[PDB]
Amino acid sequence: QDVVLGLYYMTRDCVNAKGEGMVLTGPKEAERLYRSGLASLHARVKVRIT
Amino acid sequence: EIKELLKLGDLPTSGQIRLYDGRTGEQFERPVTVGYMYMLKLNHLVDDKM
Amino acid sequence: TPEEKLLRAIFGEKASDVKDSSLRVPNGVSGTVIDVQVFTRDGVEKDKRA
Amino acid sequence: SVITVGPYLRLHQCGLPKKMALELFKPFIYGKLELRGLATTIKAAKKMVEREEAVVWDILDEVIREHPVLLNRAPTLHRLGIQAFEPVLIEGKAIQLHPLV
Amino acid sequence: EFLKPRLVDIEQVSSTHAKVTLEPLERGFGHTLGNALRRILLSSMPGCAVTEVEIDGVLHEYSTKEGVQEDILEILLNLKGLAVRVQGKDEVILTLNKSGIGPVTAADITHDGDVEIVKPQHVICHLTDENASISMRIKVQRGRGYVPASTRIHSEEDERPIGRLLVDACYSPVERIAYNVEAARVEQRTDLDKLVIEMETNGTIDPEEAIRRAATILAEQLEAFVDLRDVRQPEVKEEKPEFDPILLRPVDDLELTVRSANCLKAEAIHYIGDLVQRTEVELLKTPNLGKKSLTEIKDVLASRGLSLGMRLENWPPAS
Amino acid sequence: TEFLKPRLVDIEQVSSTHAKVTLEPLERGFGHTLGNALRRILLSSMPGCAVTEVEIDGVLHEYSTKEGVQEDILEILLNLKGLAVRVQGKDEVILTLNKSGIGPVTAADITHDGDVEIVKPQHVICHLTDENASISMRIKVQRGRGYVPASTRIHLVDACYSPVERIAYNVEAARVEQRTDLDKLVIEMETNGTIDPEEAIRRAATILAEQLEAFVD
Amino acid sequence: KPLVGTGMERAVAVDSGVTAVAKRGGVVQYVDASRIVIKVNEDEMYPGEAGIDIYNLTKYTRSNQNTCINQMPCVSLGEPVERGDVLADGPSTDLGELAL
């Protein structure tokens, strides 16, 4: 339970927030982006993935 | 009547405030509720059960 | 038995005619004694502490 | 005993009280103890762990390692009602149970 | 290629309460030293607080002094918070004495060159019958954090003084900490930041003293962090005891008479690895030992299985 | 009064670029405190050199197209952040990409300067299609402590200075023979290769130490 | 003591024996952790034997469930008490209120 409210809140998106629209090399710098308060957990973003 | 009594205490009506994680020191997104709840310790104390 | 006997003889313990039956504090629980009561049969001599 | 949480667990393990594990594996400790020579004889080993000499704890962790225990909860309804875990030592008198189980 | 901060105004506002401020701060270090200081301030700070206490005519916490309106269990719980500060000393035993229908405060103690009763109004208990009278040996040590009463018996080895009530030790003078970095521009610098660390003492640590010994730890910790030598330990200890371990125990264990107990204090004999090798020859010539005095030693050595006077071409090995 | 400093600390490294350091036994809470604080400095305020600005040869806007390149303009910009640059005595150097023809542009396909060191000449920058397909541009490296976005430049590439691609600290319990709960601190880190994880931390901690030069005695 | 209450807590504490409730109104002559003496007012006081109401308090003692049952004084020296006042709290009672 606790744990799903967890992933859900994480992988959920809102309309407009920090990080809106930027583009990133991979997940690694995406975490970097969040932990440092630049991006919102949930903001619409194109990223390179493999 | 509760909210009215919150004004006098000069505390928010949300019943919620922002909190900060003592470990990482950073803000908690969203207000969490804090307040005072009368709580009991029932006598199913562990070092009688083990 | 033999091997018990040789053992009493090597180390010199006076193998008693009385068993150890004393009331001892139960493993794990620990506290302060706050009262001792002694109840004696009518007609047996009250010991020192009693 | 009573059970509590412990999210720090890997899914293949569980939190078992220092106190309990000492009593559970008692013949095992008596064993590893005179094997490594820390005890002269079993009757000494008895007195050692009774004494809770700090030496034994390092031993207990030996005897504990690849040695699963079984955990079982109240109405055993399907086979998953008993399950086997690798024990991890805990200060406290409660059992720590992986949340996913 | 970096800057470094320092502490401008430390602003007391109560004996209990004060805001210390740290001006030259770079982007984000504000919250960095700030959280990590709250963390080392709420825990790891030095403090002295009453540890044990013996009271006049009382045997354990659960009793009742005649003519006082608290119960011993409550009186202890008043001292736990007795706020003292001492200097050169590490444990000092203050004494309390007072009679007659009257509130016994903290001020009613006796002073030592090191004793500073940082709150003399502090209620300890109330007497209540004209010639009702209390007296006590309050004992204060000074340590770190929270040593609850219980863990303070594994050292046992004769704390027998039935009178001594141990109180749980709450060794710390932080009550509650709160930093907030508001932004602060030294006139020219793009954006540096402030750091107001507001703090709440019991009265017995002066803000500066604190916030310094705080930063100090952080250094010694980070010290080992700097280079990383993969360091380890030798290990693999010895599984070869020569003798019977019995010879590594002190002469108390012999459970002997006092005149024979101190006498082995005398002739330089602690462990029984020395009593084992001193003959009957050695013993009339020892200060105060005789027929009744030494008959005693041949009988407790008999019971444990040893004898007087032998050898061992190897005593004692080897660490 | 006096304190606990750790023992047994084993850095077990996977590949030269990635590494995992475990370090016990810390006093209580000291894992999180050293852990989080070293994380903050490892991520945010760590001196590095990345690509900051790009003037392109053929087209002016970040919404245009180059002939002979399937990688969009926003695409190569991403590839650029992922090039690991280290300058020597120079605070600013700028390179020219002269390479053309049917096939992919690696970094050994860059101009080789004196105070320039490309940590991966193997690194894939962008591809080139058929025929001739001409491409040479000037790309300016900058020096800074941190990660500086293109958006924060008001008067363009996100500048990823710090060597840290990722950091996490995991704090778990450690016992010292007769101490019950101490912390065991596990730091896991990935780098851009311009500096190894092991050393990254050293200076990372050194920085924080430097900041206390005002209170310690 | 409950920050959040209902009002019954005074009713439960008193009617349950655990607290020590003033028989007759008067003033406190003496307060000990052991006992409490009430010098009765004239009005309520019977003609002969005069005297005072003396409430001897229950001290640390075993309950049925091995919990501890102990009374403590909730008044101070030379205080006015009226009939039906709370003179001493039981265990898990505060100031006349039920505090579990």
CATH of the domain at E180: 3.30.1360.10
F79 and F167 share a domain?
Answer: no
Cβ-count burial E182-192 (b if 16+ within 10 Å, e if not): eebeeeeeeeb
Using alpha carbons only, what angle is made at residue E150 by residues C49 and E76, rounded to the nearest 5 degrees?
Answer: 75
Out of G65, G67, G100, the one facing B40 most closely (by C-beta) is G100
Cβ-count burial B33-42 (b if 16+ within 10 Å, e if not): eeeeeeeeee
E221 vs E225: CA distance, rounded Å: 7
SS (H, E, C) chain F: CCCCCCCCEEEECCCCCEEEEEEEEECCCHHHHHHHHHHHHHHCCCEEEEEEEEECCCCCCCCCCCCCCCCCHHHHHHHHHCCCEEECCCCCCEEECCEECCCCECCCCCCCCCCEEECCCCCCCECCCCCCCEECCEEEEEEEECEECCCCCCCCCCEECCCEEEEEEEEEEECCCCCCCEEEEEEEEEECCCCCHHHHHHHHHHHHHHCCCCCCC
- How many CA within 13 A on the CB side of residue F144? 16
User: What amino acid is encoded at F163 in this protein?
Assistant: P
Q: How far is CA E61 from CA C33, C34, E163, E164, in A?
A: 10, 9, 10, 10
Q: Are F33 and E28 within 8 A, CB to CB?
A: no
Q: C–F contact (≥3 CB pairs within 8 Å)?
A: no
Q: Are E218 and F210 within 8 A, CB to CB?
A: no
| Cβ-proximal residues to E248 (8 Å cutoff; 6+ apart), any chain | E271, E273, E316
Helix (H, G, I), strand (E, B) or coil at G82: coil
- Chain D hits for E239, CB-CB cut-off 8 Å, are 36-38
Of E301, F177, E295, F41, whose CA–CA distance to D61 is shortest?
A: F177
Helix (H, G, I), strand (E, B) or coil at D84: strand
F177 and F211 share a domain?
Answer: yes
Q: Are B47 and D94 within 8 A, CB to CB?
A: no
F153 and F92 share a domain?
Answer: yes
Q: Give helix F197-210 / helix F30-43 axis angle, nearest 10°.
A: 100
- How many CA within 13 A on the CB side of residue C10? 6
User: How many E/F residue pairs have CB atoms within 8 Å?
Assistant: 107
Out of B22, B23, B25, the one facing E31 most closely (by C-beta) is B25
Assess F11–A contact: CB distance below 8 Å, yes or no. Answer: no
Q: Which residues, in sequence order, are bridge partners of residue F187?
A: F21, F169
Q: How many CB atoms lie within 10 A of CB A33?
A: 23
F74 and F155 share a domain?
Answer: yes
- How many CA within 13 A on the CB side of residue E127? 16
Return the structure tokens found at B28: 């908690």
D60 vs G58: CA distance, rounded Å: 48
Cα Rg for chain C, rounded, in angstroms?
19
- What are the start-end ranges of the E strands in A1-50? 23-24, 46-47
Q: Which of residues 14-33 of A touch F (CB under 8 A)?
A: 22-25, 28-29, 31-32
The residue whose two tokens read 């957990």 is A41
Given F117, F134, F161, the domain boundary residue is F161
Return the structure tokens found at F148: 């500086």
E247 inside domain: no
- Chain G hits for B38, CB-CB cut-off 8 Å, are 2-4
CATH of the domain at F55: 2.170.120.12
User: Which element (helix H / strand E) includes A8?
Assistant: helix A2-10
Given E137, E171, E205, the domain boundary residue is E171
Phi-psi region of A21 (alpha: psi -120 to 50; beta: other; left: phi over 0): left
User: How many A/F residue pairs have CB atoms within 8 Å?
Assistant: 31
Q: How far is CA C44 from CA C40, C49, F68, F216, in A?
A: 7, 14, 116, 75
E20 inside domain: yes
Q: Are F202 and E226 within 8 A, CB to CB?
A: yes
E246 inside domain: no
Helix (H, G, I), strand (E, B) or coil at D81: helix
Residues in chain E: 319
DSSP conformation letters of D22-69? HHHTHHHHHHHHHHTTSSSSHHHHHHHHHHT-HHHHHHHHHHHTT--E
F17 and F85 share a domain?
Answer: no
Cβ contact D3:D22 at 8 Å: no
E276 vs E307: CA distance, rounded Å: 6
| Cβ-proximal residues to E232 (8 Å cutoff; 6+ apart), any chain | F7, F8
Cβ contact E44:E148 at 8 Å: no
Residue E124: which domain range? 47-171
Which residue out of D8, D19, D55 would a mutagenesis test of the F interface target, given it has the greatest number of F Cβ atoms within 10 Å? Answer: D8
Burial (Cβ within 10 Å: 0-12, 13-18, ≥19) of residue C12: exposed
Determine the residue of chain F that is closest to E4 in CA distance.
F211
Return the structure tokens found at D33: 């103890």
Helix (H, G, I), strand (E, B) or coil at B47: helix
Which residue out of D91, D93, D96 would a mutagenesis test of the F interface target, given it has the greatest number of F Cβ atoms within 10 Å? Answer: D91
F148 vs D7: CA distance, rounded Å: 36
E107 and E130 share a domain?
Answer: yes
Burial (Cβ within 10 Å: 0-12, 13-18, ≥19) of residue E267: middle
β-pairing verdict for D13-17 and D82-90? parallel
Return the structure tokens found at E240: 């070869």
Closest CA–CA distance from residue A30 to any residue of chain F (Å): 9
Closest CA–CA distance from residue F43 to any residue of chain D (Å): 25
The residue whose two tokens read 């590494």 is F19
G58 vs E292: CA distance, rounded Å: 54
E64 vs E246: CA distance, rounded Å: 46
E37 vs E177: CA distance, rounded Å: 9
The residue whose two tokens read 């200097």 is E87
Cβ contact G74:G97 at 8 Å: no
DSSP category for residue D79: G
- Chain E hits for B23, CB-CB cut-off 8 Å, are 39
Cα dihedral C22→C26→C28→C32 (10° resolution): -80
| Cβ-proximal residues to D91 (8 Å cutoff; 6+ apart), any chain | D17, D18, F180, F181
Which strands, in side-by-side order, build the sheet including D3-4? D3-4, D95-97, D13-17, D82-90, D69-72
Assess E171–F contact: CB distance below 8 Å, yes or no. Answer: no
- Chain B hits for D19, CB-CB cut-off 8 Å, are 50
F2 vs F12: CA distance, rounded Å: 30
DSSP conformation letters of G14-31? HHSTTSEE-SS-EEEEEE
- Chain B hits for E35, CB-CB cut-off 8 Å, are 24-26
Q: Are A29 and F151 within 8 A, CB to CB?
A: no
Assess whether the previous peptide bond of A30 is cis (omega < 30° from 0): no
User: Which element (helix H / strand E) includes G37?
Assistant: strand G35-40
Assess E35–B contact: CB distance below 8 Å, yes or no. Answer: yes
Q: E–G contact (≥3 CB pairs within 8 Å)?
A: yes
The residue whose two tokens read 């008693």 is C16
Sign of the C-alpha dihedral, residues E253, E259, E264, E265? positive
DSSP category for residue B20: B
DSSP conformation letters of C14-46? ---SS------PPTT-------------TTSPP
The residue whose two tokens read 């020590």 is G20
- Alpha-carbon C50 to chain mean position: 17
Q: Which residues, in sequence order, are bridge partners of residue B16?
A: B33
Cβ contact E194:E183 at 8 Å: yes
Of F202, F208, F206, whose CA–CA distance to F40 is shortest?
A: F208
E261 and E306 share a domain?
Answer: yes
Q: Are E71 and G30 within 8 A, CB to CB?
A: no
Which residue out of A20, A24, A25, A46 would a mutagenesis test of the F interface target, given it has the greatest number of F Cβ atoms within 10 Å? Answer: A25
Phi, psi of G35 (to 5 degrees): -140, 170
Helix (H, G, I), strand (E, B) or coil at G38: strand
Q: Are F37 and E40 within 8 A, CB to CB?
A: no
Out of D54, D89, D91, the one facing F177 most closely (by C-beta) is D54
Q: Are G3 and B38 within 8 A, CB to CB?
A: yes
- Chain A hits for F164, CB-CB cut-off 8 Å, are 32
Return the structure tokens found at E88: 């050169």
Q: How far is CA E135 from CA D60, E58, E73, E127, F111, in A?
A: 49, 11, 16, 12, 89
Alpha helices, H only, chain G: 8-15
F82 and F168 share a domain?
Answer: no
- Chain F hits for A32, CB-CB cut-off 8 Å, are 43, 147, 164-166
Looking at the structure of chain F, the number of domains it has is 2
Q: Which of residues 19-48 of B touch D (CB under 8 A)?
A: 44, 46-47
Q: Are C34 and E302 within 8 A, CB to CB?
A: no
Phi, psi of E302 (to 5 degrees): -65, -45
Residues of G with CB under 8 A from a CB of E: 30-34, 59-60, 70, 72-73, 76-77
User: What amino acid is encoded at E110 in this protein?
Assistant: T
Q: Are E128 and G30 within 8 A, CB to CB?
A: yes
Determine the residue of chain E that is closest to G33 in CA distance.
E69
Determine the residue of chain G that is closest to E62 in CA distance.
G60
Of B47, A1, F46, whose CA–CA distance to E2 is shortest?
A: F46
Residues of B with CB under 8 A from a CB of E: 22-26
Closest CA–CA distance from residue A32 to any residue of chain F (Å): 7
E190 vs E188: CA distance, rounded Å: 7
Assess whether the previous peptide bond of E316 is cis (omega < 30° from 0): yes
The residue whose two tokens read 């078992």 is D16
Return the structure tokens found at D48: 């050692």
Out of E62, E302, E305, the one facing C34 most closely (by C-beta) is E62
Cβ-count burial E111-127 (b if 16+ within 10 Å, e if not): eeeebebbbeebebbbb
Q: How many CB atoms lie within 10 A of CB F203?
A: 16
B5 vs E9: CA distance, rounded Å: 38
E233 inside domain: no
E244 inside domain: no
Q: A–C contact (≥3 CB pairs within 8 Å)?
A: no
Q: How many CB atoms lie within 10 A of CB B6?
A: 15
Assess whether the previous peptide bond of B31 is cis (omega < 30° from 0): no
User: How many E/G residue pairs have CB atoms within 8 Å?
Assistant: 32
E52 and E164 share a domain?
Answer: yes
Cβ contact A26:A48 at 8 Å: yes
Closest CA–CA distance from residue F85 to any residue of chain B (Å): 31
E252 inside domain: no
Helix (H, G, I), strand (E, B) or coil at B6: helix
Of E45, E71, E65, whose CA–CA distance to E206 is shortest?
A: E45
Q: How far is CA G16 from CA G8, G34, G92, G96, G100, in A?
A: 12, 21, 12, 11, 13
D36 vs D30: CA distance, rounded Å: 11
Helix (H, G, I), strand (E, B) or coil at B16: strand
F42 and F83 share a domain?
Answer: no
E101 vs E120: CA distance, rounded Å: 18
G94 vs G72: CA distance, rounded Å: 10
Q: How many CB atoms lie within 10 A of CB G4?
A: 8
E8 vs G41: CA distance, rounded Å: 66
F63 and F74 share a domain?
Answer: yes
E283 inside domain: yes
β-pairing verdict for D95-97 and D82-90? unpaired
Q: Are E222 and F28 within 8 A, CB to CB?
A: no
The residue whose two tokens read 């109560």 is E14
Q: Are D54 and F178 within 8 A, CB to CB?
A: yes
Of E223, E215, E219, whose CA–CA distance to E40 is shortest?
A: E215
Determine the residue of chain A that is closest to F167 in CA distance.
A32
Given F130, F161, F192, the domain boundary residue is F161
User: What amino acid is encoded at E97 in this protein?
Assistant: N
Phi-psi region of A20 (alpha: psi -120 to 50; beta: other; left: phi over 0): beta
B42 vs E180: CA distance, rounded Å: 40
Return the structure tokens found at G11: 């009713």
Q: Are A23 and F43 within 8 A, CB to CB?
A: no
Q: How far is CA F162 from CA A23, F150, G8, in A?
A: 19, 16, 65
E211 and E128 share a domain?
Answer: no
Determine the residue of chain B that is closest to E36 in CA distance.
B25
| Cβ-proximal residues to G93 (8 Å cutoff; 6+ apart), any chain | G13, G18, G19, G99
E159 vs E176: CA distance, rounded Å: 35
The residue whose two tokens read 């590095």 is F48
Q: Which residues, in sequence order, are bridge partners of residue E271?
A: E250
β-pairing verdict for D95-97 and D3-4? parallel
| Cβ-proximal residues to E49 (8 Å cutoff; 6+ apart), any chain | E80, E82, E83, E84, E140, E141, E142, E169, E170, E171, E172
Closest CA–CA distance from residue B42 to any residue of chain D (Å): 14
Out of F78, F147, F151, the one facing A32 most closely (by C-beta) is F147
Q: How many CB atoms lie within 10 A of CB E208?
A: 13
SS (H, E, C) chain E: CCCCCCEEEEEEEECCEEEEEECCECCCHHHHHHHHHHHHHHCCCEEEEEEEEEECCCCCCCCCCCCECCCHHHHHHHHCCCCEECCCCCCEEEEEEEECCCEEEHHHECCCCCCEECCCCCEEEEECCCCCEEEEEEEEEEEEEEECHHHHCCCCCCCCCCCEEECCEEECCEEEEEEECCECCCCCCCCCECCEEEEEECCCCCHHHHHHHHHHHHHHHHHHHHCCCCCCCCCCCCCCCCCCHHHHCEHHHHCCCHHHHCHHHHCCCCEHHHHCCCCCHHHHCCCCCCHHHHHCHHHHHHHHCCCCCCCCCCCCCCC
Q: Determination method here?
A: X-ray
DSSP category for residue B9: T
Cβ contact G61:G70 at 8 Å: yes
E132 vs G30: CA distance, rounded Å: 12
Helix (H, G, I), strand (E, B) or coil at D97: strand
Of A50, A37, A45, whose CA–CA distance to A21 is shortest?
A: A45
Q: How far is CA G56 from CA E33, E197, F98, G72, in A?
A: 59, 53, 103, 11
Q: How many CB atoms lie within 10 A of CB E260?
A: 19
